[PDB]
Design a protein that fits this description.
This is part of a larger assembly, with chains A (361 residues), B (56 residues) and C (49 residues). Chain A has 361 residues and is mostly helical. Chain A is built from eight helices and five strands. In chain A, helix 2 runs parallel beside helix 4, helix 2 packs antiparallel against helix 7 and helix 4 packs antiparallel against helix 7. With 56 residues, chain B is mainly α. In chain B, 89% of the residues lie in helices and 0% in strands. Chain B contains one helix and no strands. Chain B is rod-shaped. With 49 residues, chain C is α+β, with helices and mostly antiparallel strands. Chain C has a two-stranded antiparallel sheet with strand order 1-2. Classes of the chains: A mainly alpha (361), B mainly alpha (56), C alpha+beta (49). Chains in contact: A-B, A-C, B-C. Chains A and B meet through loops of A and helix 1 of B. It is classed as membrane protein. Keywords: V-ATPase, synaptic vesicle, membrane protein. The entry is titled "Intact V-ATPase State 1 in synaptophysin knock-out isolated synaptic vesicles".
Chain lengths: 361, 56, 49
């Protein structure tokens, strides 16, 4: 959600309350939601290396922005109780996202300020990178599981010409212990089922007479077969292909079909059992990641403020939530309220007389 | 965006930052002085102790 | 983001540009900064323009 953050030199101690609810420097006449940011104090460290530090920090900030949006996109691609459209109310660490940006908590224990700010930034990079690598592995493994399910359903997808007959026919439908014979399963459509049951005698010779017994009848083509000499399989196929007698040599196997179906059921149950925890792991990864992201955004805002305002660490900032379609009036009013801060050099373009970065969906 | 004196004010920023860097240099120089007398002490103390024990 | 004084001077009678031939007025508004990164990117920019 769109959200604004502005910092100021802080020339007066009254700005402690102006960060919350000044009337003269209010936004939208005390209508926009404004709350002072939970501002920490950090060491200076450097200034000659600081410009490039903030630049690479901005590059890394775009990187982690891509990372968190990728996490949200993947969790939406889960498509069950988490989507970009429905059930999108995913709480910021169990507390509503708006409620946590309005109540951001800053901690020193995880990231001591005594260390270099580069040390903290690279530790954040390391943590987010390990999270990202684990996410790539999770994507590969779990989406491979879902693809295995989808491809096993592709094996369950299609008419009986391409779908196995495990639960339709029996072992005895062909001639077990054949002497010189083969029960060629020449599936004939319903437009011609009534024809083979009489033509089977003439369609080949050196065969078993009275082999007119049908097996089953299906919507696309009626299952059926015929017994005949091993060399005569060629001759019968060549003679029968012209009378709309499709040839489909089916092999029965109880063991292997049963094993495949058991593998399917195993995969389904194990997939639910891996899918619950998958949502849990995705949630915690996204969770720790955005908290690191709001922290690093606050860090970059701090660095820019220290760059701009002065040797003291006296500066004063606050979140801001304009009412819709009035933020242009705020653009003008805040231009007026912040131009006297500079009162000289700073066309504007992006080099505003104020400090600002944009947070959004 | 600075008047003819605020330029000097923020130049005093940059100079006080050079002072902060000189103070960090002083802190690290003193800390490494502490480390260095400890290290050189350990080295020369070990050498002298070894010579005395061999003679003994 | 540089904050150091300005050595100002002006050039009158602007001898033509060495490589083109433009007799256009010139001036110098110079400032010095300590950061090495600045000594890279600021000078890259000025070469750009």
């Amino acid at each position: 959600t769109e959200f604004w953050l502005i910092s100021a030199p802080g020339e007066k101690t009254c700005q402690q309350t102006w960060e919350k609810l000044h009337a003269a420097t209010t936004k939208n006449n005390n209508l926009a939601v404004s709350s002072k940011f939970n501002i920490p104090d950090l060491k200076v460290g450097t200034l000659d290396v600081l410009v490039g530090l903030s630049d690479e920090l901005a590059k890394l900030d775009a990187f982690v922005e891509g990372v968190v949006k990728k996490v949200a996109q993947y969790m939406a691609d889960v498509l069950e109780d988490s989507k970009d459209k429905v059930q999108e109310n995913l709480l910021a660490s169990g507390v509503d996202l708006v409620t946590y940006i309005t109540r951001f908590q800053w901690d020193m224990a995880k990231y001591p300020i005594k260390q270099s700010l580069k040390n903290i930034s690279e530790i954040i990079a390391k943590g987010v990178t390990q999270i990202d690598n684990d996410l790539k592995s999770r994507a590969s493994a779990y989406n491979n599981l879902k693809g295995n399910l989808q491809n096993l359903e592709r094996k369950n997808a299609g008419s009986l010409l391409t779908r196995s007959l495990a639960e339709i026919v029996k072992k005895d439908d062909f001639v077990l212990d054949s002497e010189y014979l083969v029960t060629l399963l020449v599936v004939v459509p319903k437009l011609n089922h009534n024809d083979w049951i009489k033509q089977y005698e003439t369609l080949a010779e050196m065969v078993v007479p009275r082999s007119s017994n049908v097996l089953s009848e299906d919507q696309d083509s009626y299952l059926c077969n015929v017994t005949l000499f091993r060399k005569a399989v060629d001759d019968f196929r060549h003679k029968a292909r012209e009378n709309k007698f499709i040839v489909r040599d089916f092999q029965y196997n109880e063991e292997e079909m049963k094993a495949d179906k058991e593998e399917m059921t195993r995969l389904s149950t194990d997939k639910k059992k891996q899918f619950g925890p998958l949502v849990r792991w995705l949630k915690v990864n996204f969770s720790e990641a955005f908290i690191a992201w709001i922290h690093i955004k606050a860090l970059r805002v701090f660095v820019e403020s220290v760059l701009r305002y002065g040797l003291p660490v006296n500066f004063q900032a606050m979140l801001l939530q304009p009412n819709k379609k009035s933020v242009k009036k705020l653009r003008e009013v805040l231009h007026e309220l912040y131009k006297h801060l500079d009162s000289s050099a700073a066309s504007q373009q992006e080099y505003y007389p104020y400090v600002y970065y944009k947070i959004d969906c | 965006a600075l008047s003819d004196a605020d330029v000097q004010k923020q130049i005093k920023h940059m100079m006080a930052f050079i002072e902060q860097e000189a103070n960090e240099k002083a802190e690290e120089i003193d800390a490494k002085a502490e480390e260095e007398f400890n290290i050189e002490k350990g080295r020369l103390v070990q050498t002298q102790r070894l010579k005395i024990m061999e003679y003994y | 983001r540089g904050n150091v004084f300005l050595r100002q001077a002006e050039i009158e009678n602007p001898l033509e540009d060495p490589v083109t031939g433009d007799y256009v007025h010139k001036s110098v508004f110079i400032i010095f900064f300590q950061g090495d990164q600045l000594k890279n990117r600021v000078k890259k920019i000025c070469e750009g323009f």
